[PDB]
Design a protein around this motif. Structure first.
Motif, mmCIF file in Angstrom:
data_model
loop_
_atom_site.group_PDB
_atom_site.id
_atom_site.type_symbol
_atom_site.label_atom_id
_atom_site.label_comp_id
_atom_site.label_asym_id
_atom_site.label_seq_id
_atom_site.Cartn_x
_atom_site.Cartn_y
_atom_site.Cartn_z
ATOM 1 N N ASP A 16 -17.330 -58.797 -64.763
ATOM 2 C CA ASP A 16 -18.390 -58.781 -65.772
ATOM 3 C C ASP A 16 -18.220 -57.502 -66.612
ATOM 4 O O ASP A 16 -17.644 -56.525 -66.138
ATOM 5 C CB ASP A 16 -19.800 -58.757 -65.119
ATOM 6 C CG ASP A 16 -20.219 -60.107 -64.527
ATOM 7 O OD1 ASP A 16 -19.724 -61.159 -64.997
ATOM 8 O OD2 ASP A 16 -21.059 -60.130 -63.597
ATOM 9 N N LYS A 17 -18.715 -57.499 -67.848
ATOM 10 C CA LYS A 17 -18.776 -56.254 -68.626
ATOM 11 C C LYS A 17 -20.175 -55.690 -68.441
ATOM 12 O O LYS A 17 -21.167 -56.436 -68.484
ATOM 13 C CB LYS A 17 -18.594 -56.535 -70.104
ATOM 14 C CG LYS A 17 -17.248 -57.207 -70.478
ATOM 15 C CD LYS A 17 -16.162 -56.183 -70.713
ATOM 16 C CE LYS A 17 -14.939 -56.834 -71.331
ATOM 17 N NZ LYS A 17 -15.140 -57.087 -72.788
ATOM 18 N N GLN A 68 -9.248 -52.950 -67.886
ATOM 19 C CA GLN A 68 -9.396 -51.903 -66.880
ATOM 20 C C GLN A 68 -10.675 -51.095 -67.091
ATOM 21 O O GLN A 68 -11.059 -50.281 -66.228
ATOM 22 C CB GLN A 68 -8.205 -50.944 -66.932
ATOM 23 C CG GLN A 68 -6.901 -51.512 -66.372
ATOM 24 C CD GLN A 68 -5.713 -51.197 -67.284
ATOM 25 O OE1 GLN A 68 -4.935 -50.275 -67.017
ATOM 26 N NE2 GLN A 68 -5.570 -51.961 -68.361
ATOM 27 N N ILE A 69 -11.322 -51.306 -68.243
ATOM 28 C CA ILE A 69 -12.491 -50.530 -68.633
ATOM 29 C C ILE A 69 -13.655 -51.486 -68.941
ATOM 30 O O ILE A 69 -13.860 -51.894 -70.089
ATOM 31 C CB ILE A 69 -12.164 -49.552 -69.827
ATOM 32 C CG1 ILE A 69 -11.075 -48.551 -69.391
ATOM 33 C CG2 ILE A 69 -13.424 -48.783 -70.255
ATOM 34 C CD1 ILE A 69 -10.330 -47.877 -70.538
ATOM 35 N N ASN A 70 -14.413 -51.852 -67.908
ATOM 36 C CA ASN A 70 -15.459 -52.842 -68.111
ATOM 37 C C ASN A 70 -16.876 -52.334 -67.884
ATOM 38 O O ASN A 70 -17.812 -53.125 -67.847
ATOM 39 C CB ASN A 70 -15.176 -54.095 -67.288
ATOM 40 C CG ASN A 70 -14.062 -54.957 -67.910
ATOM 41 O OD1 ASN A 70 -13.698 -54.780 -69.092
ATOM 42 N ND2 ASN A 70 -13.515 -55.875 -67.120
ATOM 43 N N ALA A 107 -22.254 -40.926 -65.256
ATOM 44 C CA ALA A 107 -20.984 -41.436 -65.766
ATOM 45 C C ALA A 107 -19.808 -40.661 -65.212
ATOM 46 O O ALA A 107 -18.763 -41.247 -64.889
ATOM 47 C CB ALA A 107 -20.973 -41.371 -67.264
ATOM 48 N N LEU A 108 -19.963 -39.345 -65.087
ATOM 49 C CA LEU A 108 -18.796 -38.503 -64.741
ATOM 50 C C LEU A 108 -18.523 -38.700 -63.260
ATOM 51 O O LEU A 108 -17.347 -38.781 -62.835
ATOM 52 C CB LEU A 108 -19.057 -37.026 -65.060
ATOM 53 C CG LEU A 108 -18.716 -36.582 -66.495
ATOM 54 C CD1 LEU A 108 -19.573 -35.429 -67.026
ATOM 55 C CD2 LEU A 108 -17.236 -36.246 -66.605
ATOM 56 N N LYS A 109 -19.591 -38.811 -62.495
ATOM 57 C CA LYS A 109 -19.445 -39.034 -61.060
ATOM 58 C C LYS A 109 -18.800 -40.390 -60.752
ATOM 59 O O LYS A 109 -17.993 -40.496 -59.816
ATOM 60 C CB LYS A 109 -20.777 -38.904 -60.353
ATOM 61 C CG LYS A 109 -20.621 -39.018 -58.854
ATOM 62 C CD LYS A 109 -21.925 -38.746 -58.125
ATOM 63 C CE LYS A 109 -23.132 -39.077 -58.993
ATOM 64 N NZ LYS A 109 -22.728 -39.677 -60.298
ATOM 65 N N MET A 110 -19.133 -41.406 -61.551
ATOM 66 C CA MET A 110 -18.627 -42.769 -61.349
ATOM 67 C C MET A 110 -17.359 -43.015 -62.136
ATOM 68 O O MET A 110 -16.789 -44.121 -62.073
ATOM 69 C CB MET A 110 -19.714 -43.802 -61.729
ATOM 70 C CG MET A 110 -21.012 -43.739 -60.943
ATOM 71 S SD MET A 110 -22.216 -42.615 -61.691
ATOM 72 C CE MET A 110 -21.962 -42.964 -63.424
ATOM 73 N N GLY A 111 -16.889 -41.985 -62.850
ATOM 74 C CA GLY A 111 -15.665 -42.047 -63.646
ATOM 75 C C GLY A 111 -15.718 -43.214 -64.620
ATOM 76 O O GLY A 111 -14.799 -44.043 -64.698
ATOM 77 N N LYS A 112 -16.805 -43.286 -65.385
ATOM 78 C CA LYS A 112 -16.894 -44.240 -66.488
ATOM 79 C C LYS A 112 -17.100 -43.491 -67.818
ATOM 80 O O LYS A 112 -17.735 -42.433 -67.841
ATOM 81 C CB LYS A 112 -18.074 -45.214 -66.296
ATOM 82 C CG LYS A 112 -18.216 -45.802 -64.874
ATOM 83 C CD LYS A 112 -17.016 -46.713 -64.517
ATOM 84 C CE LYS A 112 -17.150 -47.279 -63.096
ATOM 85 N NZ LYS A 112 -16.037 -48.299 -62.891
ATOM 86 N N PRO A 113 -16.615 -44.077 -68.925
ATOM 87 C CA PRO A 113 -16.811 -43.441 -70.229
ATOM 88 C C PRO A 113 -18.282 -43.425 -70.594
ATOM 89 O O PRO A 113 -19.045 -44.320 -70.185
ATOM 90 C CB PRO A 113 -16.032 -44.355 -71.194
ATOM 91 C CG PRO A 113 -15.026 -45.073 -70.305
ATOM 92 C CD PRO A 113 -15.722 -45.252 -68.993
ATOM 93 N N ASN A 122 -11.938 -49.923 -76.116
ATOM 94 C CA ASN A 122 -11.588 -50.048 -74.694
ATOM 95 C C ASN A 122 -12.502 -50.987 -73.911
ATOM 96 O O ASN A 122 -12.029 -51.924 -73.262
ATOM 97 C CB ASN A 122 -11.522 -48.677 -74.020
ATOM 98 C CG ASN A 122 -10.191 -47.977 -74.274
ATOM 99 O OD1 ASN A 122 -9.178 -48.626 -74.535
ATOM 100 N ND2 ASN A 122 -10.191 -46.667 -74.196
ATOM 101 N N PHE A 123 -13.812 -50.771 -74.012
ATOM 102 C CA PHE A 123 -14.784 -51.677 -73.392
ATOM 103 C C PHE A 123 -14.526 -53.126 -73.809
ATOM 104 O O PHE A 123 -14.544 -54.039 -72.983
ATOM 105 C CB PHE A 123 -16.214 -51.252 -73.785
ATOM 106 C CG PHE A 123 -17.305 -52.021 -73.079
ATOM 107 C CD1 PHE A 123 -17.449 -51.943 -71.690
ATOM 108 C CD2 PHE A 123 -18.191 -52.808 -73.800
ATOM 109 C CE1 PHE A 123 -18.472 -52.661 -71.037
ATOM 110 C CE2 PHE A 123 -19.205 -53.494 -73.173
ATOM 111 C CZ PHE A 123 -19.346 -53.430 -71.784
ATOM 112 N N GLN A 124 -14.263 -53.349 -75.093
ATOM 113 C CA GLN A 124 -14.234 -54.699 -75.606
ATOM 114 C C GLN A 124 -12.964 -55.405 -75.197
ATOM 115 O O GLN A 124 -13.004 -56.593 -74.880
ATOM 116 C CB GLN A 124 -14.364 -54.733 -77.140
ATOM 117 C CG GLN A 124 -15.759 -54.424 -77.653
ATOM 118 C CD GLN A 124 -15.785 -54.229 -79.192
ATOM 119 O OE1 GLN A 124 -16.326 -53.239 -79.696
ATOM 120 N NE2 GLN A 124 -15.203 -55.174 -79.923
#
Length: 228
Positions: free
Chosen positions: A55-56, A100-102, A71-77, A94-96
DNA sequence: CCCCACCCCCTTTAGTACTTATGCCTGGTTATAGATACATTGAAACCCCTTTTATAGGCGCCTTTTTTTTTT
């Protein structure tokens, strides 16, 4: 179209966080119910659950201190006010398009306006006074059907609520409003199988580290991001 | 229990000063086209070779003779 399951996820306050929450009287106390480690763990688990389904996911934080800690703790943008136009577009593209970036984190800069991207899951870390109507609007703009026409629900909204805090008052209100708007809505008190995942803050010492950091913050750190 | 006062907020827009990119124009040396220095192979253009029989000046060059100067 999109068939959305709405849920509030009620999370107990860690006793150490609840202690300080009571003692502190200024808006700084909002940070204690926002950073509550049980709520972080719920958010982390939901991202895992949904990423396994490809899922996105957009996670909304109205508070910059929280946006970054998560975000930084979970390593997400993450995207917020000072994120440059170039970096913001890199992340959105990247998201779209990059499988690898969802999951991305977005602050109050998301609504409105830049072009909020589409997602199948929207998680709101916080709840506050007082726009029930801005919430439903954002839910509507963001959520698209995961392309599961057979399935009962193909998109998901979660609002994470800290128990025993002022966050709960916003809940009877949100539930009434969302169902009146035609949404399926439920309250989740225990996320099925969080104990099968490896989530952050498993130890008291790690929670105490975060607690110290929250206590060091100021009333300014507990204000919502404002933007014009 | 009711009324008044104080505290905290978000609303969005107008100011001029300061920073960054684009156009400006400006001082070297490098890359182009053609001729110059000139050097190339090519060729044509040049004088050179066979002699005679007579006339009679000038031409340059040879060895032997006479005169002058130097030294003893």
């Amino acid at each position: 179209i999109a068939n959305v399951q709405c849920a509030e996820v009620w999370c107990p306050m860690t006793a150490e966080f609840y202690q300080e929450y009571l003692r502190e009287t200024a808006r700084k106390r909002m940070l204690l119910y926002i950073m509550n480690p049980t709520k972080f763990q719920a958010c982390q688990f939901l991202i895992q659950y949904h990423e396994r389904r490809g899922d996105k996911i957009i996670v909304f934080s109205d508070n910059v201190y929280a946006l970054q800690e998560y975000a930084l703790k979970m390593g997400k943008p993450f995207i917020y006010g000072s994120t440059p136009q170039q970096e913001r577009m890199n992340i959105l593209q990247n998201f779209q398009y990059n499988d690898q970036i969802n999951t991305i984190f977005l602050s109050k800069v998301g609504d409105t306006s830049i072009d909020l991207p589409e997602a199948t899951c929207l998680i709101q870390i916080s709840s506050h006074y007082g726009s029930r109507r801005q919430e439903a609007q954002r839910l509507g703009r963001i959520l698209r059907a995961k392309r599961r026409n057979d399935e009962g629900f193909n998109a998901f909204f979660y609002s994470l609520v800290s128990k025993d805090t002022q966050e709960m008052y916003y809940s009877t209100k949100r539930q009434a409003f969302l169902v009146d708007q035609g949404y399926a809505f439920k309250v989740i008190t225990h996320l099925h199988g969080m104990e099968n995942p490896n989530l952050a803050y498993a130890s008291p010492r790690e929670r105490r580290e975060l607690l110290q950091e929250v206590l060091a913050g100021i009333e300014v750190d507990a204000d919502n991001s404002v933007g014009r």
